[PDB]
Design a protein around this ligand. Sequence first.
Ligand SMILES: OC[C@H]1O[C@H](O[C@H]2[C@H](O)[C@@H](O)[C@@H](O)O[C@@H]2CO)[C@H](O)[C@@H](O)[C@@H]1O
Ligand SMILES: OC[C@H]1O[C@H](O[C@H]2[C@H](O)[C@@H](O)[C@@H](O)O[C@@H]2CO)[C@H](O)[C@@H](O)[C@@H]1O
Ligand SMILES: OC[C@H]1O[C@H](O[C@H]2[C@H](O)[C@@H](O)[C@@H](O)O[C@@H]2CO)[C@H](O)[C@@H](O)[C@@H]1O
Ligand code: CA
Ligand code: CA
Length: 686
Amino acid sequence: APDTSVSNKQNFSTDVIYQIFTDRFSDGNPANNPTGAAFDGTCTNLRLYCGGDWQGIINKINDGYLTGMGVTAIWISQPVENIYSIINYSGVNNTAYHGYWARDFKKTNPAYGTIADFQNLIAAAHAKNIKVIIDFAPNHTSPASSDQPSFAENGRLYDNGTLLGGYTNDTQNLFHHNGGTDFSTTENGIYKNLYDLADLNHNNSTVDVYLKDAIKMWLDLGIDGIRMDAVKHMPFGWQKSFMAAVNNYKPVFTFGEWFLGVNEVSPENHKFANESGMSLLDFRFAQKVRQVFRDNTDNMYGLKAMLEGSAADYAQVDDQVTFIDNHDMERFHASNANRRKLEQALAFTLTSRGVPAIYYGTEQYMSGGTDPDNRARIPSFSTSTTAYQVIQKLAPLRKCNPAIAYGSTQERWINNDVLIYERKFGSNVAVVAVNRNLNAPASISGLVTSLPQGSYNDVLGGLLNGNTLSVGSGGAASNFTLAAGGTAVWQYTAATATPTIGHVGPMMAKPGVTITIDGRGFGSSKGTVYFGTTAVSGADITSWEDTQIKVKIPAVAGGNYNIKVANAAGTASNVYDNFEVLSGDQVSVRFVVNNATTALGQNVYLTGSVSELGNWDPAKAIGPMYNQVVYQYPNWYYDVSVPAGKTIEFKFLKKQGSTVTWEGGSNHTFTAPSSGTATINVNWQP
Ligand SMILES: OC[C@H]1O[C@H](O[C@H]2[C@H](O)[C@@H](O)[C@@H](O)O[C@@H]2CO)[C@H](O)[C@@H](O)[C@@H]1O
Ligand SMILES: OC[C@H]1O[C@H](O[C@H]2[C@H](O)[C@@H](O)[C@@H](O)O[C@@H]2CO)[C@H](O)[C@@H](O)[C@@H]1O
Ligand SMILES: OC[C@H]1O[C@H](O[C@H]2[C@H](O)[C@@H](O)[C@@H](O)O[C@@H]2CO)[C@H](O)[C@@H](O)[C@@H]1O
Ligand SMILES: [Ca+2]
Ligand SMILES: [Ca+2]
């Protein structure tokens, strides 16, 4: 199948995602609507159920709303059973309409539909080449109080109907009882409650095994991807172990929510996206798009630095899910705003690197402040808006123009208000010119591109006041005027002769797991695939076609490898780096080291005998370790994904910058559990 196939669960870079708050989209089956105080059919009270369901989505998938817009994937609210309580928060009634208050991850929220409804949703979507992403929020259950067990459902957790436990009398330690986080440190936000949400303890084996089994049920139901909630709030090591359970079973595109504020750039965020086994929602891209196009708090140079910085910071920048707004921001379109600002921000996102995501109703110019005001029912299903047309014209290019799906990004012309950038992949090119200045045109001269000689019509057809471009020898464009608020897209497409890799997924799995290598010019006959210097060919290459290769990971030692392919004639492709071969199935193990005193600016890290612990390379040690919450300095702790059942030798390190101090004495040893979790507690050896 081609890289662009609906069947490709590992690559969403050629797709355009439409994020749907299920309850607020379309009530296709009134019979499953919640009743009484939990319901508002008029959807005036945005905190109660308005009736939106899976049957309504199936309807809008079948009547052309989404397909006519060029949407090729949907990301829907968490599908699992939620508590039924109507929680009164200081005089105001609140319902689980959002799907974030799970009670049973093995069942459906009956308000959305049954299991059968879900299967129908999956089938209806696939029949229309639309992929289905589900939200999954394994960080907590629901609002709970230990001392007031009658409040809400006491964060109770069930396993397909069977009670596992609640927040009160949590003798099993299913949850954390450390108070609530003030978001003051990352450690603090991981091990303390988010608001009043009962925080799940992933170090509890029952919780661990349960969540990993629950996701398998969803994978079996045919989902194509997962949107993980609150990733900055669960142990990174446990999450890596959770991504390995997914990938070592049935891999699907996964991205997590890790909020970043205006002007925030977090190296922690980068390393997570780079090493966890899941990518992230691109808040850095989104917040910068809002400053430049929405709020006027930064200009094109700042958009350019974000583009260049992110391409450098994210190992797979093309896996980052971009957007201009979501359920946790004020709607991009301000009631009083010029619509062109939204149109432009949209055109920019759709033609930029990564995986574009559109919040439902953006194409309808919905406006609204923060929660729950950004979550109104979609007021119209009109295909006639300028915004809808922009998406319609640009969304499909991610499938037909691989420069947009996988290309590099290059600035070709720039000033405070204008940015002309170029995407390129193999024999494919796309050039986009944007003039944020809504009152002043710009005179464009000296623009040089990789576009072949000729006249190029604006793909948007002048919809956003774009123009035709004339390119001469050298890719030099003749002078032109870029209209006020003008936006234009020019492209060139042709068959690619040399093997070129545009994407790899999943990026972490154990040997034997099948990976998907997508791009152009692989040719029709099986060639060779390389993992580092190791060559794979023949039977282990399950399938091979010009744009997509399916191959089994060889049984090489656990570690990081660069992927390269060669065609049947032996011509090599570019190298796609950072593939991580796991040492085997993974379990989440908590390491604890006592009496590891440090100087300010120095932290403790873990290193050891397996690739999962960096193979004794301080440059790859695990950390920095924690020392506030579960244990207190000078005792440090950290949850780490390690190979199940393996006997592993380890040591702790004190690092400052790249300077390293090793624990003295002999290595410590332990044998990882074959399943579930474990905790190893040792003393720092001088
Ligand atoms: O001609 C090559 C040149 O193109 C662009 O330079 C623009 C510049 O961004 C504008 O602000 C203005 O000065 O016109 C220049 C071209 O005449 C690229 O930005 C630049 O890197 C490139 O060398
Ligand atoms: O909270 C983490 C903190 O740990 C390390 O600092 C120790 C410090 O070395 C001791 O001198 C003492 O002051 O307790 C600190 C922890 O409260 C790291 O030095 C520091 O960078 C890190 O944030
Ligand atoms: O480099 C491989 C080597 O790393 C670790 O050895 C440490 C040792 O523990 C330290 O006390 C100090 O001497 O530095 C060595 C690294 O240069 C592992 O302990 C050892 O097994 C491993 O082979
Ligand atoms: Ca309904
Ligand atoms: Ca947590």
